[PDB]
């Protein structure tokens, strides 16, 4: 009966997280410390920050966070699936089926799931060739907040991310989120957002005594710095000689002017001021003469250097420079043009040769809906990154779960051993993700999961409806949608690995008997 | 608080009868005072068996019984509508409305509902005495009681009741009665003219078409035997004289056929085969058994004196349905009493049932059928029943509430909500989420169709046009239903404290 | 929720405790300190420092009464009774569902009328010694034994006559009461000038 | 319904009932019973909210969001909790009868959107560039809260402060929340001579009798061309062995600071800025210098004070070479009042530290002023973008409810009922005002709603000072657009953040 108490504890910890599944999942209260209360609906956060004193919950959550840290998001699904199969296996134990029997059944069901998911319901990284549609659907559902303008986000994302190419083991086509720079802006009509196939920023105006204003055949990757407010102290306070720490400061300013003359002699029109510039220096050198920038984003600086095949650390030991820079920073952008673009004074750089990165400027109207826009773009870019970097995708939502449930029920009806109920009841329990998503979608689960079962049966019993295999639900809807006009998806690797870890957690927690 | 305690009784009664509202409604078992168990759908019989100690419950109970007195169709509508009305009145009093203003608003809203409900009439029973229309009209009441026998009971009620409407002015509902055939299929029931009774009649079948009935209740008695002292008698003269007395009594019967004209007679007391062959030589019939209700109803309808006297027929018992017959339809012999003239041409349904517990339920169904046939007879106008009229009245009352200023506005709004509360209860009974179906139907009623109602037989919240479906409802029945419902509701809300 | 009923009851209790104390004919009350010593008094100023107030909003009323009476200090008790009677009638009128804020508005209008009518009630005269000794007598008699009040009142009116040149208020620097234990009061009159400790 | 959700609803209703009648200009009183002794009378709801912290439901979220709204805006923001409590009470009426925890969220989002749309509709325009109007409107609005006599005095000075405060950002054209608008508790004096101070107090200058007086040009000098770091820890790190030796080793670095301060003397700037400290022994030597040394200033100080001055970053007193922001500090004044002579520096058309010239024998009037200028700050901030403001005071609630219900009448789906429920729940503010004033809550509410049903009556409402249905237009009392919209924003946001909760721990 102590294993049944383990079952009750696991069911409790699963019910804690059930309502948090899915993007429409409700938020959860959890109090690790008396001093503050945390409001989050993220499964990983709620499992990590919360703890349950019962050992079975400890084991289940430890496997869940193993899954989380080793294959990424999905820990909430792992907890829900594992504990539902756990409770259902307890139901079998009340039917006098010994725990080892349902252990063998869960192992066989996991094996058949791994075989079936990889074989019959899968896409070969091409999105069946409909990438310019699934993304169009995906942008719609990844961004509910945007609404009307829609397809333009998709038409930009598809090529702005396909323009990326990382370098890694055998060169997988993973295109990270940082490959595009999000430039929050507003003031214009909410109809467009110019993507920079390359990078963009702003610089000083009027002081542009250099050809960056026009077409540059060759560019640089150079850093920059000018100072008169005590930036560089080569000598310290160690002695009190009253007039002996002001001439080194001014002379460092003069030798920095010598440095920039050594830089401006070579030109190459890409000059970027590094951090540390005091506001006093900012208001000084707009008049005193500076080929500077207003300390543009250092993250953007690093991603620019990566997007130009040359980082200043390869020639200089720091980001300021006192030794003469080598020609390694000679940039190779095909086109650099300054334009009065989007009614702002940006610099526009095309797709720089060698390693490269993308960007976007926002043609927004007012601050807050443009913040909403800056959020939706991040969501869309990150989730499409998930889809493509997965390099293999399973139909998301409840589609794979319902298909696996029906197929495993048939397999159980065609297996014939002591663990025959184990396969079928594993299948029935595995409907918990469709059930939980339907409940969280304000819909009646008994009807939505029913439609999923009916569609998957009709799809895999009569081969005339192969495309009917790809219908699932994740979000509030009146009728479940097909994942070929729609585009809700999950990586097949993370989904199958999360299912494997849920099965393994169930096995480990049922192997503990007395 | 005293008023809320009074309302709680109607609240619990409304929740009790809510499950039984309409087709697909929850069944209920009620226990008779003699522990007899049977399941039923009729809320009227639920109230008949459910004791109601709280006075507000009794208020709603005789509201439903006055509904019985006026028109049988809609008796449960009164109870559930009054319960919803008191729910909304409880909400108003919790808000802080005075009882007087709540009553004023409810009365004015009820008056305008009465004047506007005939504007919701889609059509009328233009073609009575024709099976095609009247069977469909009866279908709604039949399904209201029993959903598994929609059209067969409707058409048998049609073909029966059409035969009891020659006068063209009106007819008496008692002229349609039911008889019992146990252990038989429900589909084997059939209509017959005049009263029929299953149980055997003594003597060979003569069926004189002018048998002016000799009317008695128990003209014969059971077995007895004298005791000379404590111990029994030892002579058969008490039996021989009894047999000869019965023989001479029926000899005087075939004498008194001159002033009585009786080829048939009825009894509740046993007779023997001696009476059998006496009847065979006298060519008469004698029904050996009937129940007390059957005997009494026969006594009134024959319009003749009835008494349990061992006496030959007399002049003061002239039979009404002198044209007597017998039948065997539904593989069961039945005696038949009929009269050829059209006025008061009573007819009966030979109800065939394998289960008495189902048998009295279909008895209640046929009673409501003849009641709604009476409703159509007194007024042919029909209204789109099935929550369509409820939402239409609710929408019109809400339009009034938004257009009429004053303190009664809340009363108007919550009376409209009480009207809305009928289709949501029907949806709860049918097995569909009430909020979504109410919202969908209410949105459909905002434009175009004025008669569309919810589809009970669909799983997803669905709303279908009522006319094309043919489950319409009575105008006058609904009018009186809301009238009595709001009257009882305002009377029970007016009382502030019950007194010992 | 008529939670103001407990506040009205507290006002009733503090009124009753401050009842029986008005006028020369009224009783006085003793404040038994935690040290066990004795303190006879009649004035409400120190009676509202009887730290056994036994109820919190009663303590509120006591401290606000002391604060608002320290400016004049001739009208402190009476204040408790007037507020107690206002709250008595207020309870009498809340008991029929009436909202207290309009009661307070009526009180404000009543105050606006009462101050104007009081401005006409007051008599204005040059403070000769007879009227001054009469007012000192009627102010002091309501706090001291009647037979002993007058010998104090003459010294009081002498003290207030000593500083008549300028409209400046009472100051302890020109009137410093000094005490010493003795067998009999025996004409507890002022002395002109200063007395040493 | 989910039992824990109903508990959150009940807690929200509890706090809502705590301060529901504590709303409006005729607010009811509340008692705080401190078990260790004492008691507080208060009708300022936020004071209760800060004190009543015994709550341990998820109403922690409501309390923290109320404190956030108080620190950002403050004036009249108590109504957000009344609105949230009423909306959650009417949410429960649906959540418990049939479970639907998410569609109610969609209904509340739609309600918030339509409320924003209708507030931007029914509102009455106001100018921000003529005295003859905003003077009247803000005078009335400020007078609503706590002022009887000083309205005409404090209003002018606070509004002029925000007018000076206007144009700070020069980008988003948004002024400070509080980074500039500080205040100094200037004590005593004739309270009526509290006048405008279009500048800021400079506290620590004149503590000694002889510090600095009346320099026009805001000169400063730093360790650039005539000053050096070798003033600091110029010989050895400080060691601790005994108090006398500790003071001697402190005065070591202090005397080297004295040496470079005596070199500062011949440089003769108006002020100087230091972050570590300055020596009073050198400060006594500043008569010919006429300089003041301000020390141990935080980055906020070295930002706002320096840019309030627009300080001249000079090397010698006979030249002008660089200013922080031009001649920002037009004037500097020391009034010969108080032991610490109050140095006031005057700046023009610039973002700057803020302080007002105030006088008072009691600090109640000297603490009302900042919560007046905060309201003035909200008024200027919303009118500079939206020249627009709202009836408010419970009057606009009926107009918003009528518009919302009118839109709902044409709305399908199950979300219709909670959306109209929000419409009805908004009526609490006029309802609580009428209940507060003792008038018939239901009768007056019905009359006001019916009159709002009539055409072009969107400004009709209740006067909280009299308890009657008279119109709020042409009566003079109004509420700011930003305050009203942000009140709805925070109310619906806390409503959704409380309904989105469906379990604890
Ligand atoms: N097939 C149907 N679909 C929708 N509504 C129906 C259907 N059949 C009957 N109804 C409605 O359901 C209502 C239920 O009323 P009811 O309480 O059963 O009347 P009574 O109990 O007096 O016979 C009826 O008035 C009828 O209009």
């Amino acid at each position: 009966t102590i294993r049944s108490q383990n079952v009750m504890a696991a069911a409790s910890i699963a019910n804690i997280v059930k309502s948090s599944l899915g993007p429409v999942g409700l938020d959860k209260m959890l109090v690790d410390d008396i001093g503050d209360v945390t409001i989050t609906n993220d499964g990983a956060t709620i499992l990590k920050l919360l703890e349950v004193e019962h050992p079975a919950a400890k084991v289940l959550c430890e496997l869940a966070d193993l899954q989380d840290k080793e294959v990424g998001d999905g820990t909430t699904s792992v907890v829900i699936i594992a504990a539902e199969l756990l409770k259902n296996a307890d139901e079998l134990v009340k039917q006098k089926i010994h725990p080892t029997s349902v252990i063998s059944g869960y192992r066989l069901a996991c094996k058949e799931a791994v075989r079936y998911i990889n074989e019959n319901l899968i896409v070969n990284t091409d999105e069946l060739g409909r990438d310019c549609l699934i993304n169009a659907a995906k942008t719609s559902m990844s961004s509910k907040i945007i609404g009307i303008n829609g397809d333009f986000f998709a038409n930009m994302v598809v090529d702005a991310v396909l323009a990326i190419k990382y370098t890694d083991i055998r060169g997988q086509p993973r295109y990270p989120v940082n490959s595009v720079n999000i430039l929050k802006a507003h003031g214009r009509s909410q109809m467009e957002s110019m993507l920079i196939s390359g990078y963009a920023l702003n610089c000083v105006v009027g002081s542009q005594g250099m050809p960056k204003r026009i077409v540059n055949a060759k560019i640089a990757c150079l850093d920059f710095s000018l100072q008169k407010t005590k930036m560089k102290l080569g000598v310290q306070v160690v002695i009190t000689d009253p007039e002996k720490l002001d001439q080194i400061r001014q002379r460092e300013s003069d030798i920095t002017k010598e440095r920039i003359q050594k830089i401006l002699a070579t030109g190459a029109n890409v000059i970027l001021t590094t951090g540390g510039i005091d506001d006093m220096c900012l208001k000084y050198f707009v008049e005193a003469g500076a080929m500077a920038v207003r300390r543009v984003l250092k993250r953007d600086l690093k991603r620019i250097a990566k997007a130009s095949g040359a980082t200043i650390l390869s020639t200089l030991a720091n980001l300021e420079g006192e030794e003469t820079f080598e020609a390694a920073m000679l940039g190779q952008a095909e086109e650099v043009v300054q334009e009065r673009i989007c009614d702002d004074e940006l610099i526009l750089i095309k797709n720089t040769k060698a390693r490269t990165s993308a960007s976007i400027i926002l043609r927004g109207a007012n601050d807050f809906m443009c913040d909403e826009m800056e959020r939706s773009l991040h969501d869309a870019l990150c989730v499409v990154k998930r889809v493509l970097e997965s390099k293999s995708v399973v139909p998301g939502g409840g589609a794979v779960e319902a298909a696996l449930s029906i197929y495993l029920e048939n397999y159980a009806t065609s297996m014939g051993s002591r663990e025959q109920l184990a396969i079928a009841e594993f299948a029935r329990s595995l409907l918990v993700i469709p059930n939980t998503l339907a409940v969280n979608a304000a819909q009646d689960s008994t009807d939505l999961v029913a439609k999923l079962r009916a569609f998957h049966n009709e799809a895999q019993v009569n081969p005339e409806r192969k495309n009917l295999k790809w219908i699932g639900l994740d979000l509030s809807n009146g009728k479940p949608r097909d994942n070929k006009q729609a585009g809700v998806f999950e990586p097949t690797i993370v989904k199958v690995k999360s299912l494997k870890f849920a099965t393994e957690a169930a096995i480990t927690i049922l192997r503990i008997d007395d | 608080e005293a008023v809320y305690r009074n309302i709680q009784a109607c609240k619990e009664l409304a929740q009790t009868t809510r499950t039984a509202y309409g087709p697909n409604g929850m069944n209920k078992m009620v226990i008779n005072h003699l522990e007899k168990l049977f399941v039923t759908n009729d809320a009227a019989t639920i109230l008949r068996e459910l004791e109601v100690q709280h006075p507000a419950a009794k208020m709603i109970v005789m509201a439903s019984h006055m509904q019985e007195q006026e028109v049988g169709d809609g008796t449960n509508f009164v109870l559930v509508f009054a319960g919803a009305l008191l729910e909304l009145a409880e909400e108003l009093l919790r808000i802080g409305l005075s009882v007087s203003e709540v009553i004023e608003g409810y009365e004015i809203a009820c008056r305008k509902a009465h004047e506007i409900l005939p504007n919701l009439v889609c059509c009328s029973a233009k073609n009575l005495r024709d099976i095609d229309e009247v069977s469909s009209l009866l279908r709604t009441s039949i399904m209201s009681k029993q959903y598994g026998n929609e059209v067969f009971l409707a058409k048998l009620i049609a073909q029966a009741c059409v035969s009891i409407f020659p006068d063209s002015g009106h007819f008496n509902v008692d002229n349609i009665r039911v008889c019992k055939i146990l252990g038989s299929g429900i589909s084997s029931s059939s209509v017959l003219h005049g009263m029929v009774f299953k149980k055997e009649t003594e003597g060979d079948v003569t069926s004189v078409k002018d048998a002016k009935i000799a009317v008695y209740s128990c003209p014969f008695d059971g077995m007895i035997t004298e005791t000379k002292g404590t111990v029994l008698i030892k002579t058969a003269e008490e039996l021989m004289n009894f047999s000869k007395g019965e023989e001479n009594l029926m000899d005087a019967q075939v004498k008194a056929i001159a002033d009585t004209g009786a080829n048939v007679v009825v009894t509740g007391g046993k007779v023997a085969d001696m009476a059998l062959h006496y009847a065979n030589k006298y060519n008469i019939m004698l029904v050996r058994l009937n129940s007390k209700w059957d005997l009494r109803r026969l006594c009134k309808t024959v319009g003749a004196t009835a008494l349990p006297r061992l006496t030959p027929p007399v002049l003061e018992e002239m039979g009404h349905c002198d044209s007597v017959y017998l039948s065997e339809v539904g593989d069961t012999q039945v005696v038949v009493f009929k009269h050829e003239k059209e006025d008061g041409a009573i007819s009966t349904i030979v109800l065939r049932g394998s289960t008495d517990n189902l048998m009295d339920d279909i008895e209640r169904a046929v009673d409501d059928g003849v009641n709604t046939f009476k409703v159509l007879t007194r007024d042919k106008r029909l209204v789109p029943g099935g929550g369509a009229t409820e939402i239409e009245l609710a929408k019109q009352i809400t339009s009034y509430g938004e257009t009429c200023p004053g303190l009664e506005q809340y009363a108007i709004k919550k009376f409209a909500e009480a009207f809305e509360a009928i289709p949501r209860a029907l949806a709860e009974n049918s097995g569909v989420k009430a909020n979504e179906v109410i919202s969908k139907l209410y949105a459909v009623h905002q434009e175009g169709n004025k008669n569309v109602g919810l589809d009970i037989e669909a799983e997803v919240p669905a709303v279908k046009d009522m006319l094309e479906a043919g489950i319409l409802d009575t105008y006058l029945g609904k009018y009186w239903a809301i009238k009595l419902a709001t009257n009882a509701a305002v009377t029970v809300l007016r009382v502030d404290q019950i007194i010992m | 929720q008529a939670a103001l009923a407990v506040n009205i009851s507290a006002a009733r209790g503090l009124q009753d405790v401050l009842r029986t104390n008005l006028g020369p004919k009224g009783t006085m009350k003793m404040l038994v300190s935690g040290a066990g010593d004795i303190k006879l008094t009649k004035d409400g100023n120190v009676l509202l420092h009887e730290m056994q107030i036994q109820h919190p909003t009663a303590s509120l009323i006591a401290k606000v009464a002391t604060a608002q009476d320290d400016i004049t200090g001739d009208g402190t008790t009476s204040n408790v009774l007037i507020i107690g009677e206002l709250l008595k009638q207020a309870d009498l009128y809340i008991s029929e569902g009436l909202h207290p804020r309009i009661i307070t508005e009526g009180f404000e209008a009543a105050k606006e009328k009462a101050l104007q009518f009081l401005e006409e009630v007051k008599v204005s005269r040059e403070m000769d010694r007879e009227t001054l000794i009469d007012v000192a007598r009627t102010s002091l008699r309501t706090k001291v034994h009647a037979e002993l009040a007058d010998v104090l009142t003459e010294a009081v009116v002498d003290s207030i006559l000593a500083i008549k040149k300028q409209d400046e208020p009472i100051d302890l620097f020109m009137i410093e009461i000094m005490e010493m234990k003795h067998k009999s009061e025996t004409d507890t009159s002022l002395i002109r000038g200063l007395v040493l400790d | 319904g989910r039992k824990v959700q109903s508990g959150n609803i009940n807690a929200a209703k509890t706090i809502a009932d705590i301060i529901r009648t504590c709303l409006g200009p005729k607010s009811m009183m509340k008692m705080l019973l401190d078990p260790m002794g004492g008691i507080v009378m208060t009708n300022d709801g936020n004071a209760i909210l800060r004190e009543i912290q015994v709550q341990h439901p998820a109403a922690k979220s409501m309390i923290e969001i109320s404190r956030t709204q108080d620190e950002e805006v403050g004036d009249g923001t108590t109504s957000v909790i009344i609105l949230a409590g009423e909306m959650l009470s009417v949410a429960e009426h649906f959540l418990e009868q049939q479970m639907h925890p998410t569609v109610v969220i969609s209904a509340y989002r739609k309600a918030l959107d339509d409320m924003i749309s209708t507030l931007k509709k029914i509102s009455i325009p106001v100018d921000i560039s003529d005295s003859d109007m905003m003077l009247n409107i803000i005078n009335s609005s400020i007078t609503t809260k706590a002022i009887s006599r000083w309205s005409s005095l404090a209003c002018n000075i606070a509004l002029d402060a925000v007018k000076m405060v206007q144009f700070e950002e020069n980008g988003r054209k948004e002024i400070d929340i509080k980074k500039y608008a500080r205040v100094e508790k200037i004590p005593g004096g004739i309270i009526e001579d509290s006048c405008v101070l279009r500048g800021v107090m400079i506290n620590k200058d004149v503590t000694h009798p002889r510090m600095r007086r009346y320099i026009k040009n805001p000169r400063i000098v730093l360790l650039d061309s005539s000053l050096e770091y070798k003033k600091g820890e110029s010989q050895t790190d400080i060691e601790i062995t005994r108090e006398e030796d500790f003071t001697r080793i402190l005065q070591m670095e202090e005397e080297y600071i004295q040496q470079l301060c005596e070199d500062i003397i011949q440089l003769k700037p108006d002020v100087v800025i230091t972050e570590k400290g300055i020596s009073d022994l050198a400060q006594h030597y500043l008569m010919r210098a006429n300089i003041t040394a301000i020390r141990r200033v935080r980055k906020t100080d070295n930002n706002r004070i320096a840019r309030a001055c627009g300080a001249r970053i000079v090397s010698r007193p006979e030249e002008l070479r660089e200013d922080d922001v031009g001649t920002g500090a037009g004037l500097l004044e020391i009034k010969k009042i108080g032991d610490e002579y109050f140095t006031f520096i005057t700046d023009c058309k610039d973002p700057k530290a803020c302080t007002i010239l105030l006088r008072g024998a009691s600090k109640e009037i000297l603490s009302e002023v900042e919560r007046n200028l905060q309201d003035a700050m909200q008024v200027c901030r919303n009118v500079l973008l939206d020249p627009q403001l709202v009836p408010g005071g419970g009057a606009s609630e009926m107009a918003v409810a009528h518009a919302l219900t009118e839109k709902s009448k044409a709305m399908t789906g199950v979300e219709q009922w909670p959306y109209r429920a929000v419409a009805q729940a908004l009526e609490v503010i006029p309802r609580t005002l009428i209940q507060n004033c003792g008038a018939s809550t239901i009768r007056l509410l019905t009359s006001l709603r019916a009159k709002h049903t009539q055409e072009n009556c969107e400004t009709w409402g209740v006067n909280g000072e009299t308890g009657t249905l008279v119109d709020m237009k042409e009566l003079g009392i109004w509420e700011p657009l930003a305050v009203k919209l942000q009140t709805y924003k925070t109310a619906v946001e806390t409503a959704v953040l409380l309904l989105r909760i469906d379990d604890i721990v």
Side-chain angles (χ1 to χ4, degrees), chain C residues 56 60 63-64 99 101-102, chain D residues 26-27 39 435-438:
Chain C
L60 182 63
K63 65 182 181 180
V64 300
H99 201 69
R101 184 61 161 250
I102 69 163
Chain D
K26 197 169 292 290
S27 66
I39 187 165
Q435 192 93 41
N436 189 359
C437 298

Short mmCIF file of all heavy atoms in Angstrom, two decimals, chain C residues 56 60 63-64 99 101-102, chain D residues 26-27 39 435-438:
data_model
loop_
_atom_site.label_atom_id
_atom_site.label_comp_id
_atom_site.label_asym_id
_atom_site.label_seq_id
_atom_site.Cartn_x
_atom_site.Cartn_y
_atom_site.Cartn_z
N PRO C 56 -10.04 49.89 23.41
CA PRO C 56 -9.16 50.73 22.58
C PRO C 56 -9.77 52.00 22.02
O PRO C 56 -9.15 53.07 22.11
CB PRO C 56 -8.75 49.77 21.45
CG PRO C 56 -9.88 48.81 21.34
CD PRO C 56 -10.39 48.63 22.74
N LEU C 60 -8.94 55.98 22.31
CA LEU C 60 -8.95 56.98 21.25
C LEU C 60 -9.73 58.21 21.66
O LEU C 60 -9.23 59.34 21.54
CB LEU C 60 -9.56 56.39 19.97
CG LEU C 60 -9.57 57.32 18.76
CD1 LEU C 60 -8.16 57.70 18.33
CD2 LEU C 60 -10.33 56.72 17.60
N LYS C 63 -7.86 60.20 24.45
CA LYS C 63 -6.68 60.97 24.05
C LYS C 63 -7.05 62.13 23.14
O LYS C 63 -6.47 63.22 23.26
CB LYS C 63 -5.63 60.05 23.40
CG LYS C 63 -6.02 59.42 22.09
CD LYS C 63 -4.90 58.51 21.60
CE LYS C 63 -5.24 57.86 20.27
NZ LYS C 63 -4.15 56.96 19.78
N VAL C 64 -8.01 61.94 22.24
CA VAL C 64 -8.41 63.05 21.37
C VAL C 64 -9.11 64.13 22.19
O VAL C 64 -8.95 65.32 21.91
CB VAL C 64 -9.29 62.56 20.20
CG1 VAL C 64 -8.53 61.55 19.35
CG2 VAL C 64 -10.59 61.99 20.71
N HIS C 99 -28.14 55.97 7.37
CA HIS C 99 -26.69 55.97 7.19
C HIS C 99 -26.03 57.08 8.01
O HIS C 99 -26.49 58.23 7.98
CB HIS C 99 -26.32 56.13 5.72
CG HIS C 99 -24.95 55.64 5.39
ND1 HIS C 99 -24.60 54.31 5.43
CD2 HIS C 99 -23.83 56.31 5.03
CE1 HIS C 99 -23.33 54.17 5.09
NE2 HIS C 99 -22.84 55.37 4.85
N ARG C 101 -23.41 58.99 7.77
CA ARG C 101 -22.72 60.15 7.23
C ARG C 101 -23.64 61.36 7.12
O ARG C 101 -23.22 62.50 7.36
CB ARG C 101 -22.08 59.82 5.88
CG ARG C 101 -21.26 60.97 5.31
CD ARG C 101 -20.13 61.30 6.28
NE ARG C 101 -19.02 62.05 5.70
CZ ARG C 101 -17.82 61.54 5.48
NH1 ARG C 101 -17.54 60.28 5.75
NH2 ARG C 101 -16.87 62.33 4.97
N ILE C 102 -24.91 61.14 6.76
CA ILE C 102 -25.85 62.25 6.78
C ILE C 102 -26.10 62.71 8.21
O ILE C 102 -26.39 63.89 8.45
CB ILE C 102 -27.16 61.87 6.07
CG1 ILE C 102 -27.92 60.83 6.88
CG2 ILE C 102 -26.87 61.36 4.67
CD1 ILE C 102 -29.35 60.69 6.48
N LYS D 26 -16.11 62.01 0.39
CA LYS D 26 -16.86 61.92 1.63
C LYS D 26 -16.63 60.56 2.29
O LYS D 26 -17.55 59.92 2.79
CB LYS D 26 -18.34 62.18 1.37
CG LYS D 26 -19.16 62.53 2.60
CD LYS D 26 -20.55 63.03 2.25
CE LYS D 26 -20.48 64.38 1.56
NZ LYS D 26 -20.07 65.46 2.50
N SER D 27 -15.37 60.12 2.28
CA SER D 27 -15.03 58.75 2.65
C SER D 27 -15.35 58.45 4.11
O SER D 27 -15.26 59.32 4.98
CB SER D 27 -13.55 58.50 2.37
OG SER D 27 -12.74 59.29 3.22
N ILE D 39 -4.07 53.36 18.61
CA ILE D 39 -5.11 53.20 17.60
C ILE D 39 -4.96 54.35 16.61
O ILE D 39 -4.49 55.44 16.96
CB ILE D 39 -6.52 53.17 18.24
CG1 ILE D 39 -7.60 52.85 17.21
CG2 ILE D 39 -6.80 54.47 18.96
CD1 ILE D 39 -8.92 52.44 17.82
N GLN D 435 -23.65 54.86 -1.61
CA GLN D 435 -23.78 54.21 -0.31
C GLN D 435 -23.06 55.02 0.77
O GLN D 435 -23.54 55.13 1.91
CB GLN D 435 -23.21 52.80 -0.37
CG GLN D 435 -23.53 51.92 0.82
CD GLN D 435 -24.79 51.10 0.62
OE1 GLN D 435 -25.03 50.57 -0.46
NE2 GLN D 435 -25.60 50.99 1.67
N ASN D 436 -21.91 55.60 0.43
CA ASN D 436 -21.17 56.43 1.36
C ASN D 436 -21.96 57.68 1.74
O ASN D 436 -22.00 58.07 2.91
CB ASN D 436 -19.83 56.81 0.74
CG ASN D 436 -18.90 57.49 1.70
OD1 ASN D 436 -19.24 57.72 2.86
ND2 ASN D 436 -17.71 57.83 1.22
N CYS D 437 -22.60 58.31 0.76
CA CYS D 437 -23.33 59.54 1.01
C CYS D 437 -24.69 59.32 1.66
O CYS D 437 -25.39 60.29 1.95
CB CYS D 437 -23.51 60.32 -0.29
SG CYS D 437 -21.96 60.83 -1.07
N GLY D 438 -25.08 58.06 1.87
CA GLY D 438 -26.32 57.76 2.57
C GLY D 438 -27.57 57.78 1.72
O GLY D 438 -28.65 57.46 2.24
#
